[PDB]
Design a protein around this ligand. Structure first.
Ligand SMILES: [Ca+2]
Length: 223
C-alpha cells in the first residue's frame, strides 16, 4: 500500500497473508475454511496465515494453515487478468475469534462514490520497493467506470472496477495483490493490477467481487 497508514493492530481480521516461504500476496477470509484471492496469485503450495499484524514477529494471535485445494476461476486469463479471482479451501477450519474474522460478500455492486478499505503487506513506495512489516490500510472510493477506462484504454473488462485517486499518491501495489476492497463491510474488489504505483492518471484496478458471488457460492458447495 502506498500513501496509507498503519492499521490499528488486528483491525482487519478478515485480512490474510499467503505464504510461499515469504509473503507474496493477500486475501480475505470469507468463511471459516475458504479464502478468496486473485488467480494471478496461484502457487502449487500456499500457507495461509490468519491473525497477522506484524508479518515478521510472532505476536500471539496468528494461525497458519495450508491450502487444501486452490481454485483459479476457469475463465482466468493470465493475459488480460480478466476474471482474476481464485478460491482456496484450507486443509481444516480456522478458529474464528476477534483477530480472525470473516467478511461478507456483495449484496449488490457498490456505487461509484463509495469509500472502501484497502490493505496488505504489499510494497509501500511509488518507485523502488519497500516491503513493510506491519499491515497497511488505505481509504479510497470507487471511481466511475468511464474514468477507469480513460486511464486504461480498451484494457478493462467489465469485471474490473477502478479504486483510488486519479491524482495518484495513494494506491495498492504488487504484494498487496489478492487483498480486499471492503465497502461498508462487504468485499467489493480484489487487488488486481495497474500501470505503475500511486502514479497520477493510473488508478489501480480491482476485480469486481459482486460479479462473482454466483461462482463463489456454488463453487464452495461443489468443493
Ligand atoms: Ca506475526
Amino acid at each position: 500500500i502506498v500513501g496509507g497508514y498503519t492499521c490499528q493492530e488486528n483491525s482487519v481480521p478478515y485480512q490474510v497473508s499467503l505464504n510461499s516461504g515469504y509473503h507474496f500476496c493477500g486475501g480475505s477470509l470469507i468463511n471459516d475454511q475458504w479464502v478468496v484471492s486473485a488467480a494471478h496469485c496461484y502457487k502449487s503450495r500456499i500457507q495461509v496465515r490468519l491473525g497477522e499484524h506484524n508479518i515478521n514477529v510472532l505476536e500471539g494471535n496468528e494461525q497458519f494453515v495450508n491450502a487444501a485445494k486452490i481454485i483459479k476461476h476457469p475463465n482466468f486469463d493470465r493475459k488480460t487478468l480478466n476474471n482474476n479471482i481464485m478460491l482456496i479451501k484450507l486443509s481444516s477450519p480456522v478458529k474464528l475469534n476477534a483477530r480472525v474474522a470473516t467478511v461478507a460478500l456483495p449484496s449488490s455492486c457498490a456505487p461509484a462514490g463509495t469509500q472502501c478499505l484497502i490493505s496488505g503487506w504489499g510494497n509501500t513506495l511509488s518507485s523502488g520497493v519497500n516491503e513493510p512489516d506491519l499491515l497497511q490500510c488505505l481509504d479510497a472510493p470507487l471511481l466511475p467506470q468511464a474514468d477507469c477506462e480513460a486511464s486504461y484504454p480498451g484494457k478493462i473488462t467489465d469485471n474490473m472496477v477502478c479504486v483510488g485517486f486519479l491524482e495518484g499518491g495513494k494506491d495498492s501495489c504488487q504484494g498487496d495483490s489478492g487483498g480486499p476492497v471492503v465497502c461498508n463491510g462487504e468485499l467489493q474488489g480484489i487487488v488486481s493490477w495497474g500501470y505503475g504505483c500511486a502514479l497520477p492518471d493510473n488508478p489501480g484496478v480491482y476485480t469486481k467481487v459482486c460479479n462473482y458471488v454466483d461462482w463463489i457460492q456454488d463453487t464452495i458447495a461443489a468443493n
